[PDB]
Structures are given as structure tokens and as C-alpha cells.
A and B are shown apart, each in its own frame.
Chain A
Amino acid sequence: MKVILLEPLENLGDVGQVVDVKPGYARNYLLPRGLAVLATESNLKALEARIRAQAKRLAERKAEAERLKEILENLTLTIPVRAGETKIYGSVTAKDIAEALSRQHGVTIDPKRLALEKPIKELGEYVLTYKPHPEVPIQLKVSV
């Protein structure tokens, strides 16, 4: 009894799987509760449509969210907000870094995603990270 699952359940593989059962089990429990569906070619095929249109439509976050490292990885920042002897001008913060994360050129930008633990408020050569796929740590130069 070919059946395609949904909310995965023990003894039966994870969601969207072509697992076999007992006719009764399916007709009187699964299907009724919407915990599965019949492996009718009509769906069994419309499933691959969930696949290719998700597996072959993944070269975007996996193969293009990456280009957020092909251009804004190897390009200096340098804080145009000088400083004292060591405590930086502009406090150098997630914002005073995200303002021109895209300004410098023109392809992508972001504000929150930053391995910025605590506001720098101190001169130096910092280089933290971003997210979520391969983490891209950008070179920030807290100049004086």
C-alpha cells in the first residue's frame, strides 16, 4: 500500500516518503486524519514537482547567497570616523558597519547578521562574521 506521509511518524520514514502499510491502516487512520496520502501516480508524480522545484531551485541560497563573499569579502572597510588614542570615533557598531555593507558597490546589504559581540568602542583591525550558509567574515578597519 504505497502511501506518501506528511507529519513524519515512527515506524514510517520522514515526511513526503513512499512508505508501505496495511490497506486498513491507511484507509481508516492515516488518510482520514490527513497524516498521509495515497501513492497515486497523480500525486506520486506531483511530488517530484516538490523536489526538482526545490532541489534544482536551490542554486540561489546555496549557489548565489554565496556571491555575498565573491565581492564583499576581500574589500577593506575602514571607519571614516577617526578617534582618540584608542576608543574609536562613531563607537563603530553593527550599524556603523552595515550602513555601507552595500554602499561600497551594489549587489547586497545587511544589518543584523554580525558576529559583533559587544560594540567595539576601541580602535583596531577587526574582522568578524555574517550568516547563514558558509559564514563570510568581512574585514573591517576601525581606523583613527
Chain B
Amino acid sequence: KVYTIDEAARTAKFDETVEVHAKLGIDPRRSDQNVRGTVSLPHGLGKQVRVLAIAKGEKIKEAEEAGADYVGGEEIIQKILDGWMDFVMGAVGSKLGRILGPRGLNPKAGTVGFNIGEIIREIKAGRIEFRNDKTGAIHAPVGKASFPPEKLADNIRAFIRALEAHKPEGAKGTFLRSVYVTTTMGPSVR
């Protein structure tokens, strides 16, 4: 077995919910290990990708044609901290942590897709995909999936999660690669 059959992940109404779990070093030293949210992924899910990437206020026009259905600007600033937990944004770029009511009061706060104009470009690949998480005081890794619309496309997690790790100092060994959830379980050799 030099590989792992890309087919067998068959309790749902459309299986594309398969996850990707793991387990390396638990709370190494006094730090740990966190994974970036919307990196890219070799595919791009299929759910309502509301990348509310709250970037410049100039992200309502062209920033809603190749990224997300609704992208915050400057009208959804402190008008989201005084209108209940209804009015999850991300953050901005550069050295100006403008967390007025989207990255301080509690969800995302990564950054803004370096464009400083809008969000419809085509020099990237992480507009409508799957986010991520982090450790867990016991477990780690965390993610979603890639996309269900091909053949051997089930090996998209063996290169975006099972073949892409560079955020750990010194611990011991990252042995797990046991993925697939909300349906089956592919704890094979990933």
C-alpha cells in the first residue's frame, strides 16, 4: 500500500462534509500551533461562502463579484456592535488593527486580500473555499474539505492538510491523518 484509495467516503443528503483530523504536539513548550483560516485549498467547497472580509469601504462594489456575497466596508463598522450579534467579518491589512466591531468584539481577524481597491481579481485562489481552526488543548489540525465534483479529487486533503504543515516548533511526532467526518471515516495513511 503505497497510496490510499480516493473512494469509500460513503449519513447525509450530499456527502462533501468529510473532514480532515490529525494529532501532533500538544501545547509544545509555552506556545502551540495554529492553522490559517481561508488559505486556498486545491478546490473550493460548495456552501454559501460569505467571505465578509471587512476590507476598505471600497469593498462593496467590485469586492462582491469574485469573493463573497457580502463584504463589509465602513457602514458595517461600529454599526455591528450596537445592533446585536446580527449586524462574521475578518479584518484589514497593513499596520492598522482597526477592530471597531468585527475583529475585537468575536470571530475572524486575519487580514484583507491585498488589493487596496476591491475584490474581483484572478491572481489568487481562496475566495469560495473552506476555512480552518487550530489546536484544542488536546487535539489539533481542524478543517473542512475541498470539493465533490471529479474522480480522484478526494486526494485534495493529502496536499492541502496531509501534505502542507509548517507551523510547529519542537514537540515529538505528528501521527494521525485520520480524516472524514459527518459520514464515514478515512483514518488511512495520510
Physical contact A–B (CB less than 8 Å) = no
